[PDB]
Write a protein that binds this ligand. Structure first.
Ligand SMILES: COC(=O)c1c(OC)cc2cc3c(c(O)c2c1C)C(=O)[C@]1(OC)C(=O)C=C(OC)[C@@H](O)[C@]1(O)C3=O
Ligand SMILES: [Mg+2]
Lengths: 114, 120, 56, 209, 122
RNA sequence: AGGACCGAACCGACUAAUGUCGAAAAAUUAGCGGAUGACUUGUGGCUGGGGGUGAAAGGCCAAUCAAACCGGGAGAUAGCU
RNA sequence: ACACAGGUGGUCAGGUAGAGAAUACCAAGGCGCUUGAGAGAACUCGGGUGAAGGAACUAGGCAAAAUGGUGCCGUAACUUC
RNA sequence: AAUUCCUUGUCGGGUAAGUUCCGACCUGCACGAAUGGCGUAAUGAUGGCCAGGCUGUCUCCACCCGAGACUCAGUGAAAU
RNA sequence: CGAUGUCGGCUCAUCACAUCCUGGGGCUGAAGUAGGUCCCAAGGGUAUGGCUGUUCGCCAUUUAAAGUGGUACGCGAGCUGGGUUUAGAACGUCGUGAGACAGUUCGGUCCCUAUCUGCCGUGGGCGCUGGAGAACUGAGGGGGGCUGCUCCUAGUACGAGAGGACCGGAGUGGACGCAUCACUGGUGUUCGGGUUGUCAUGCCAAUGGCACUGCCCGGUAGCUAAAUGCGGAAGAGAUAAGUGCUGAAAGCAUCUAAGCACGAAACUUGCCCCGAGAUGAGUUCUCCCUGACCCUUUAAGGGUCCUGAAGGAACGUUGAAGACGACGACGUUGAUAGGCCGGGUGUGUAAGCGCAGCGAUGCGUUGAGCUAACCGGUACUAAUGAACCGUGAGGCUUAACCU
């Protein structure tokens, strides 16, 4: 409907970087510890992008110290502070779900340099 | 439960539906009027009218895209030459369904469907 | 699964009270030709709303 | 107090400043206009009868067209009724808008829910499905036993069986009002209300407070 | 989403390497355990020099799930595997000293602050 | 070489589901066993009813088997219904 | 007993892939199985896919899923070698 | 124990929990030496038991694709 | 005994109360916490596993609690067939034997298309006294009702100490129910892509068929849970067990005889849903019809002609409504469906051409091409002028009212 689109475009953040799946992206989110409120980085490869306007999302796969972490981020949420593309990746797919069962030298993807 | 679902299953599987709608789209192009069942005629507008809209732009990509459908070079030649420019000003709605009685064999409601020129 | 007494002719008469057919009551006339037909159906000659659509 | 009649137009979410996303339902509540005010002397009870929206002139029949012409209001679609809660009085022809909910904090949204058609007992009443194998002959989603034996000799009234599910008047109680926007004729309530998108809602303040 | 018979990895250095949930604690007919819930486990596989041995019935708090926890803005944090940290079967304050891998902010719950301190991330 | 191995035809019939007023008075579907042998198959023979035949189940002997079928004694007999 | 999903000995037997008369797609040849038309409920049958868990099911892993080819490397207890 | 009634004997193993299984004990209701006793490689659509893999078997079902069911036309049964 | 189906499990139950939990009290050898016992109370709630065919039981681990019974030891025209009750075989034992077990053990066909009652749903007919369109009133009925934990009160009351509250308040779960698709996901054989074998489109290139959607990788809409909203109440009336006030019979005493006040998840309401076939058929608002004649056994009579309202139905386009009916939207004075246009979304850089390379293949054109059910539009196509049904002031009696 038209009333939904008018109510959602009042709420979208208007400065978002244009990244693709396969890109390596550092995301800074707002972490609250009591009254203290800092920023914590979460840098990994982007494996899927849900492109839905205000309901847009993207999940980032980060192989941390011994464990693989997979975190989705609502893009226009005020929790996500900064999105920055560290490295552009060259994959010819939209969803990179095959990366969940690959480690090390098989889970790396080639630079785009387009 | 079928909420907002489109497309008639028509008591076939999906390969039969794609095959027979490929057949009666080419015969609707060839003779410019056919007699069929009324539920089968309403589902033919969702097949043959994108084939006429594909004929508005004569290109090698469109003629191969309209050859991946209909699988018949005589249909690709009557489109893009005799149906593309002939319907080039019509903004959709290239067919017309006219109900014609009931079939004698099984009491099936029948319909004529034709391209809207048929000037003889 | 099966009946225990047989139903009477009175009972199958009451079940068949909805088996009764209904008529059409909606024969039209053509604009030019004058033939009787159904609503939204072409005539036997091939007219619909005063236009020989079928040419056959 | 009295309620208002709106129209469910989709769902969306509101992002608050402290991170929290709240799922809202956008109810479009136009200006309800009173068509009949009922009194104790003429009706045995006091209530108001409002209408909302608009209806085409060739579809408004002559009996109901005279009912709108007596109030002198525009012929909207549908007619609803709200009992006056002993401390409010309304005049015929008054236009009530969504800014009545500007101080209400919880509402009860009554709608007609989605219709599931003929539903089995697994969907309708959350019956446990029998086992898929280990012998089972033609009895997977069947209800099983429906009564006891010769001593009851019957099925009890109100036995949970298959049948029509949904397409039914459902009220969801105590929904938080997120935002009342009188200029866009909007009402955002936190959560899900009954019905599909485009259906009539009856929004009234929550009696459970 | 941990139920009975679920095999979990072990996130501290207590000695166990693979444990199996035998009960989800707190409330009747409770089917699942999230990422801050306490389960009863048995130890199916341990290291030789550990503080716990195979076949031992004690408690554990779930710290990681493949299903994951949902933050209050829609966001979900999923892991590659279910992990837990072994408790003391009649008290809190876990047996192990080091804690491996990340944890979640939901574990910051006034009695697992020992686990928040010893964890390398989150 | 082999009552060897895997595996079609062919011969069997272990499990499951369907069917069970069946499509069928025992099958179908999906798997299953043997598959150069104490194998299997065509044609023609031989064994006949207290008899045959039986790697033996009281199995089989024309959809019938703790004594076949047909005709006769015969309207057996029935303190039973 | 049927215009019956069964039974019936022998002969001929191509192309591409394949070890192959397996299997898949085709040739020669032969067919669409003698009620159709719609709709897209429960439920039943035959299937497909499934979050997290992974036999907790159950009399019993019944059923389903899985394994699967060729070359090479490698292979324990036990043994009548 | 294909044998044991008391009995789920006792003890050990495996399990968080084991009337089953395995190992042992001997008080063998009522084992036993060609109506064979005790072993045994290989074998088995054989009986029990455990483990890995695997999974809608299940927690707990959801959705989809077809065939019926439902409606229309033609034909047209059955048990009782 | 011319058939009434055996154990347990599954699925689904329903009732009782001799009450397991929650609730209200009396007594205690009741300090508090926690109990014991008795009384009242059936509103709701009342485990998962290991072993075994088992009910049971033992054990492990839970839980506020893991209640006891009745209902053909509920439930096989609902399922199973492990147990025992057929035919095979063997062991122990008994018997000379055929065979048989206070016995073990391995194997072993579970049919029914629902006429009636009942029940879940959903229609048709008629009635409700002129017809019709709406909105209601509510008799009556149904659903729902469970509870933990932490904190505050307060380490206060209590106690030598260890311990540790009542009464109130806040927060948060488990189980269960309803709704929903905004998010997280499943599905998505109608969307896009990759790839194997083979056949075909004359061939290359490009595509199509078939092989379970050939095998797969994603994925729109819808549907849906694991997803996330909400609910269980407070209050009120009458009480149970119980505690009382005043008070005699019986100068006192005494909760009771007169009178009076409290008192529980039970009862009646409050909350949600159905509901005037509630034949006691209700109420309100609005709309429509105010023509002639004849005939007879003159009656709430029959017949002809003219008329044909409001409204309904039928038909068509349909729907987040649906088995069919029904229900909702629309029918040209029209966005109802299809198409079309723009967008979105999904998939990941189409074909053709050019370039680089021996070639496979890469690069450029190019986030390209295609894109279902989605959104916003747009009369291009199909929703027809009609006809059909339903009428022509609506009984009697009595009262009160204008005449
Ligand atoms: C106690 O358990 C029974 O009540 C029972 C049973 O429980 C499932 C099944 C059956 C099955 C059957 C029979 C039964 O008696 C029987 C019995 C008694 C027969 O008598 C049978 O005819 C039907 C026949 O005459 C000869 C045969 O073998 C010689 C059988 O195979 C037979 O064919 C059959 O199927
Ligand atoms: Mg037999």
């Amino acid at each position: 409907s038209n009333i939904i689109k008018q109510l959602e475009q009042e709420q979208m953040k208007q400065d978002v970087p244009s990244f693709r799946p396969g890109d390596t992206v550092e995301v800074k989110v707002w972490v609250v510890e009591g009254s203290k409120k800092r920023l914590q980085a979460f840098e990994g490869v982007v494996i899927a992008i849900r492109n839905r306007g205000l309901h847009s999302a993207f999940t980032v796969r980060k192989i941390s110290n011994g464990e693989g972490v997979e975190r989705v981020f609502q893009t226009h949420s005020p929790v996500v502070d900064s999105i920055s593309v560290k490295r552009r990746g060259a994959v010819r797919k939209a969803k990179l779900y095959y990366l969940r069962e690959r480690t090390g030298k098989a889970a790396r993807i080639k630079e785009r340099l387009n | 439960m079928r909420h907002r679902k489109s497309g008639r299953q028509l008591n076939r599987n999906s390969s039969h539906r794609q095959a027979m709608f490929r057949n009666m789209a080419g015969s609707l192009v060839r003779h410019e009027i056919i007699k069929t069942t009324l539920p089968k005629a309403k589902e033919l507008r969702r097949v043959v009218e994108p084939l006429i809209t594909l004929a508005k732009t004569d290109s090698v990509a469109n003629r191969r895209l309209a050859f991946a459908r209909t699988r018949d070079n005589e249909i690709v030649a009557k489109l893009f030459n005799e149906l593309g420019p002939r319907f080039a000003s019509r903004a959709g709605g290239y067919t017309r369904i006219l109900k014609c009685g009931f079939r004698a064999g099984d009491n099936a409601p029948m319909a004529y469907i034709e391209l809207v020129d048929r000037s003889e | 699964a099966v009946q225990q007494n047989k139903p009477t002719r009175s009972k199958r008469g009451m079940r068949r009270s909805h088996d009764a057919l209904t008529a059409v009551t909606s024969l039209s006339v053509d604009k030019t030709s004058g033939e009787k037909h159904l609503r939204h159906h072409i005539t036997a000659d091939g007219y619909y709303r005063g236009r020989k659509v079928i040419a056959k | 107090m009295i309620g208002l009649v709106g129209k469910k137009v989709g769902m969306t979410r509101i992002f608050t400043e402290d991170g929290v996303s709240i799922p809202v339902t956008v109810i479009e509540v136009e200006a309800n206009r009173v068509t009949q005010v009922k009194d104790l002397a003429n009706d045995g009870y006091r209530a108001i009868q409002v209408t909302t929206g608009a209806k085409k002139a060739n579809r408004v029949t002559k009996p109901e067209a005279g009912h709108f012409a007596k109030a002198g209001v525009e012929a909207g679609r549908g007619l609803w009724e709200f009992r006056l809660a002993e401390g409010e009085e309304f005049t015929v022809g008054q236009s009530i808008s969504v800014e009545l909910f500007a101080d209400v904090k919880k509402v009860d949204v009554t709608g007609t829910s989605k219709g599931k058609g003929f539903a089995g007992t697994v969907k309708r009443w959350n019956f446990r499905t029998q086992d898929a194998t280990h012998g089972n002959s033609l009895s997977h989603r069947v209800p099983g036993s429906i009564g006891q034996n010769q001593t009851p000799g019957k099925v009890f009234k109100g036995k949970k069986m298959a049948g029509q599910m949904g397409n039914e008047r459902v009220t969801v109680q105590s929904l938080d009002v997120v935002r009342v926007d009188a200029e866009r004729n909007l009402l955002l309530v936190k959560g899900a209300v009954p019905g599909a998108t485009g259906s009539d809602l009856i929004v009234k303040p929550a009696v459970k407070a | 989403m941990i139920q009975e018979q679920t095999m979990l990895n072990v996130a501290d250095n207590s000695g166990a390497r693979r444990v199996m949930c035998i009960k989800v604690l707190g409330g009747s007919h409770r089917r699942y355990a999230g990422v801050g819930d306490i389960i009863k486990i048995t130890i199916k596989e341990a290291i030789p020099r550990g503080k716990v041995k195979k076949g031992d019935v004690l408690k554990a708090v779930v710290v990681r799930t493949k299903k994951g926890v949902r933050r209050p803005d829609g966001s979900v944090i999923r892991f590659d595997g279910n992990a837990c940290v072994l408790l003391n079967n009649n008290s809190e304050q876990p047996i192990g000293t080091r804690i491996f891998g990340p944890v979640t902010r939901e574990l910051r719950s006034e009695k697992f602050m020992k686990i928040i301190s010893l964890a390398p991330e989150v």
